[PDB]
Amino acid sequence: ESPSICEGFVQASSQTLVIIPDNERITSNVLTTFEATRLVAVRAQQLAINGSTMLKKKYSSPIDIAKQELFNRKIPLLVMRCIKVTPEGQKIVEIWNPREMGIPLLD
Amino acid sequence: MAMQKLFTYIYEFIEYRKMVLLEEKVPYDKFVQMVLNTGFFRINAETLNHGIVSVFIFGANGKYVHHGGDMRTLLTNTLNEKKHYEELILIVDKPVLSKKNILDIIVEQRAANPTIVINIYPYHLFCINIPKVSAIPKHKLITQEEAQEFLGREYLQPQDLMQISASDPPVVWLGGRPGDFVQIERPSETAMHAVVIRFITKSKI
Amino acid sequence: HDIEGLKQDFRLEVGDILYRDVVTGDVAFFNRQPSLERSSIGVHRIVVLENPKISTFQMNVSACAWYNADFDGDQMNLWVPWSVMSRVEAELLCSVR
Amino acid sequence: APSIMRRLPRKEGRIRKSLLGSQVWSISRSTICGNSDLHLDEVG
Amino acid sequence: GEDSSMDDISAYSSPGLFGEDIIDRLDDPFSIEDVDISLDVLDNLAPQ
Numbered sequence: 129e130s131p132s133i134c135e136g137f138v139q140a141s142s143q144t145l146v147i148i149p150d151n152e153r154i155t156s157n158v159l160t161t162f163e164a165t166r167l168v169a170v171r172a173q174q175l176a177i178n179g180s181t182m183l184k185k186k187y188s189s190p191i192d193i194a195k196q197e198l199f200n201r202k203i204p205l206l207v208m209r210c211i212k213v214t215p216e217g218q219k220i221v222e223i224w225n226p227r228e229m230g231i232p233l234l235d
Numbered sequence: 236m237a238m239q240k241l242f243t244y245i246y247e248f249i250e251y252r253k254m255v256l257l258e259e260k261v262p263y264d265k266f267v268q269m270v271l272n273t274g275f276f277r278i279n280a281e282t283l284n285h286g287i288v289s290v291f292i293f294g295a296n297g298k299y300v301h302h303g304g305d306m307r308t309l310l311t312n313t314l315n316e317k318k319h320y321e322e323l324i325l326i327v328d329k330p331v332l333s334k335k336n337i338l339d340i341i342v343e344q345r346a347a348n349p350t351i352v353i354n355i356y357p358y359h360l361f362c363i364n365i366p367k368v369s370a371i372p373k374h375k376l377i378t379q380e381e382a383q384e385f386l387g388r389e390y391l392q393p394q395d396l397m398q399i400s401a402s403d404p405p406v407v408w409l410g411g412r413p414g415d416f417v418q419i420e421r422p423s424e425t426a427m428h429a430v431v432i433r434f435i436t437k438s439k440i
Numbered sequence: 441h442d443i444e445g446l447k448q449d450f451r452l453e454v455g456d457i458l459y460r461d462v463v464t465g466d467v468a469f470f471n472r473q474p475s476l477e478r479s480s481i482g483v484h485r486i487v488v489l490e491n492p493k494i495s496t497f498q499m500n501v502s503a504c505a506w507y508n509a510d511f512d513g514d515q516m517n518l519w520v521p522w523s524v525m526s527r528v529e530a531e532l533l534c535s536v537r
Numbered sequence: 538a539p540s541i542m543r544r545l546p547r548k549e550g551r552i553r554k555s556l557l558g559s560q561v562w563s564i565s566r567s568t569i570c571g572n573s574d575l576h577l578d579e580v581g
Numbered sequence: 582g583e584d585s586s587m588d589d590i591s592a593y594s595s596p597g598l599f600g601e602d603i604i605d606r607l608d609d610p611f612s613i614e615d616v617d618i619s620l621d622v623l624d625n626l627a628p629q
């Protein structure tokens with residue numbers, strides 16, 4: 129009996145974001161090439177949809193502007209890294225800063 | 236010639252487990268004839284926990300490895316002895332492990348006696364100094380507190396770690412109960428030896 | 441809108457999307473099947489051969505080791521990333537260097 | 538006739554053809570050929 | 582005894598192969614069933 133829904137606790141309990149203190153993070157302080165590439169791609173798409181920038185040197189493509197923002201440490205994004213899914217509905221992340229963190233080769 | 240090798244390496248295993256003997260050591264001849272006639276050689280060991288561990292070296296084709304009534308009688312009467320009896324160990328021939336009725340009596344007495352742990356091992360576990368084998372890296376049991384510290388630093392529940400059966404020869408020689416952690420120093424062609432921590436699960440039947 | 445029906449538009453607003461041709465310098469994925477190796481798909485900078493009589497994909501010979509290819513008649517798929525995200529990723533992550 | 542379940546398995550099935558792979562737009566295929574005057578990271 | 586009307590035409594197509602009744606189920610070790618290549622791209626699998 130029952131249509132697989134009435135007893136179905138399908139709605140997962142909402143999670144609370146716990147941010148690990150800045151002195152407790154144990155992940156690399158250097159952007160992995162995946163993370164740097166994702167940051168550049170997100171920033172460049174957002175410049176395509178919006179167009180605003182903090183650069184002084186004006187470029188003719190959002191890719192170049194986002195790449196320089198990552199290189200010149202003005203990209204307005206925060207890489208958050210998540211390490212847990214606790215049964216207590218408590219997602220454990222540590223929010224890193226791409227401006228403070230090192231930058232891989234990418235070239 | 237598994238009898239002589241088993242006879243020397245069981246005592247080496249008792250020494251490896253950091254246990255003391257409650258009796259005097261008979262020689263090879265008395266051991267083998269008593270095994271052949273009685274059907275088992277019983278060895279008592281005392282641990283630092285002041286618990287008692289008994290080992291039963293069953294015969295290859297004796298009276299005790301074929302019929303469940305006698306095996307049941309042995310377990311019932313030996314487990315009511317007033318020793319602390321931390322762990323009981325049965326060392327039997329390899330083909331005996333497939334024989335069902337012995338496994339049934341083993342599990343029945345395990346369920347009947349909760350606090351006592353019973354394990355039945357084949358001969359090949361105690362026919363060689365297992366920790367001294369070249370191919371076997373160095374296993375060591377980390378305490379619960381340091382394992383918990385390692386897990387909490389790693390944000391890992393114990394079930395996340397790689398599993399190792401409690402019947403693994405190095406773990407058996409170490410004396411690893413299920414639910415405990417074993418740290419391993421495995422040689423590596425890449426990093427020149429590396430350390431892993433494995434979770435001990437329930438043994439084989 | 442098609443570009444041949446826009447004789448009177450002449451205006452591209454901010455936020456308009458234009459689909460321009462692939463020019464020399466653009467990045468493009470270059471793949472030979474079967475894709476056994478990690479290098480079987482890589483990104484090459486486009487060199488547009490403006491000779492209309494040429495229809496083959498041209499690669500440096502030393503670049504064949506990436507795809508285990510030869511020129512005995514092999515065919516390789518090529519697609520140009522058009523989205524900003526895929527272009528960034530292609531030049532920063534999948535470049536043959 | 539091919540039923541619902543026959544659509545799933547095998548290479549040409551739903552999974553191994555439509556899900557694990559896909560057909561795409563904006564992709565071109567052609568015969569490769571050598572070009573000694575192209576950089577290793579360049580395609581003609 | 583001479584019923585050419587109801588005759589198993591499945592045997593009219595003569596069994597010109599030795600092992601026909603036997604059935605092989607394992608994957609044929611010559612097929613592209615588990616490999617993924619398209620037509621005119623199978624030329625890349627040519628010699629060399």
Ligand SMILES: [Mg+2]
Nearest residue numbers: 510512514625
């Ligand atoms: Mg070829």
